[PDB]
Design a protein around this nucleic acid. Structure first.
Ligand SMILES: Nc1ncnc2c1ncn2[C@H]1C[C@H](O)[C@@H](COP(=O)(O)OP(=O)(O)CP(=O)(O)O)O1
Ligand SMILES: [Mg+2]
Ligand code: NA
Ligand code: NA
Ligand code: NA
Length: 326
DNA sequence: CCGACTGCGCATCAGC
DNA sequence: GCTGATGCGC
DNA sequence: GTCGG
């Protein structure tokens, strides 16, 4: 694709800033620049040309000039050579290990995949499962497997109660040919912004999926959010499917459209859209869109009857899920 | 120049 | 136990 | 690291 070279460079820089420097703004600055260049329908021929795009300022422009001229970036080359940065970067690849825990571990001389396995008593539960499935979680999910997964989740949900609606979101809903994980939006008429007239609404669904050996592990769980591990059943003599990440979000039914907009993403699209909302004087989360008052406080939830209504409020033309892959 | 940068659930820890 | 802050991941 | 005001 693209300016793949340049966007990979920026991504690597973002990851460095987040994992090593713990500089979260530089990290989102890089991700924004990577995103806007990924979308740019021209092979970038100079940093000057790139600087025209929003989110590419002077520093990134100079970096792009270097990369175009030499095929690489000295800054990254040093970072790759530095033992400590490389170690921290690697450890953050385990789910549940972030920049802080990674640096904690490196400080203790825990630097490798083997070190982690040898020190499992030093891991919290999430981290333990992330280590367990380190390999599998590196693998993307072909859309073909995503479709099989959807059929299982939806049918099992129906069996618990026919009034549940489960909607697969994330990259899948945007039409991707492969997904990093499975994002499931859940609603039930007993759970609204006005009342929860049934307890355990999410629990029952997770229970069912455990019962049929679809959900294999739990990373975290509460009343509206489940995050864990699942696996497709395999056939006689067939190798097993990799284990896969799964998140289920229970959203009040009268807030479906905000919820499905959030969970459909992408993450950077959501950020771009929420930023723009602020510029139009609204705030958007996965529940509501509310006006901001002069005082700087969110007012009362606006009526929403579609995804498009949310776009309409902030004066954006509607964009289909497939065109939100920023 | 420089304040502002999207928003939030769950796990964990600190302090009481 | 609680509250509030931080870590981590969507 | 970038940028609107
Ligand atoms: N930081 C964030 N801020 C706002 N919204 C966010 C954020 N992270 C996430 N989201 C929303 C959008 C995303 O599609 C959805 C699922 O989160 P995921 O992290 O699964 O994103 P994906 O778009 O599913 C790519 P994949 O194929 O690698 O899985 O959750
Ligand atoms: Mg996903
Ligand atoms: Na720019
Ligand atoms: Na991680
Ligand atoms: Na997910």
């Amino acid at each position: 694709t693209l300016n793949g070279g340049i966007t990979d460079m920026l991504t690597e820089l973002a990851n460095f800033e987040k994992n090593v420097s713990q500089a979260i703004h530089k990290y989102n600055a890089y991700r924004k620049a990577a995103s806007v260049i990924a979308k740019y329908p021209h092979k970038i021929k100079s940093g000057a040309e790139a600087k025209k795009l929003p989110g590419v300022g002077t520093k990134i422009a100079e970096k792009i000039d270097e990369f175009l001229a030499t095929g690489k970036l000295r800054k990254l080359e040093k970072i790759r050579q530095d033992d400590t940065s490389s170690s921290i970067n690697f450890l953050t690849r385990v789910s549940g290990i972030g920049p802080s825990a990674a640096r904690k571990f490196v400080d203790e001389g825990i630097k490798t995949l083997e070190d982690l396995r040898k020190n499992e008593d030093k891991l919290n539960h999430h981290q333990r499962i992330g280590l367990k499935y380190f390999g599998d979680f590196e693998k993307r999910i072909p859309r073909e497997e995503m479709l099989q997964m959807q059929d299982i989740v939806l049918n099992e949900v129906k069996k618990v109660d026919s009034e549940y609606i489960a909607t697969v979101c994330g990259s899948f809903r945007r039409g991707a040919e492969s997904s990093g994980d499975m994002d499931v939006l859940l609603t039930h008429p007993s759970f609204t912004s006005e009342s929860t007239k049934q307890p355990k609404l999410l629990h029952q669904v997770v229970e069912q999926l455990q019962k049929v050996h679809f959900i294999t592990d739990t990373l975290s769980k509460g009343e509206t959010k489940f995050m864990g591990v699942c696996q497709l059943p395999s056939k006689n003599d067939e190798k097993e499917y990799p284990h896969r990440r799964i998140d289920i979000r229970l959203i009040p039914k009268d807030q479906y459209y905000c919820g499905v907009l959030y969970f459909t993403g992408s993450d950077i699209f959501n950020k771009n859209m929420r930023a723009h909302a602020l510029e139009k004087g609204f705030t958007i989360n996965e529940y509501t869109i509310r006006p901001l008052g002069v005082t700087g406080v969110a007012g009362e939830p606006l009526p929403v009857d579609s995804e498009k209504d949310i776009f309409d409020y902030i004066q954006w033309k509607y964009r289909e899920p497939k065109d939100r892959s920023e």
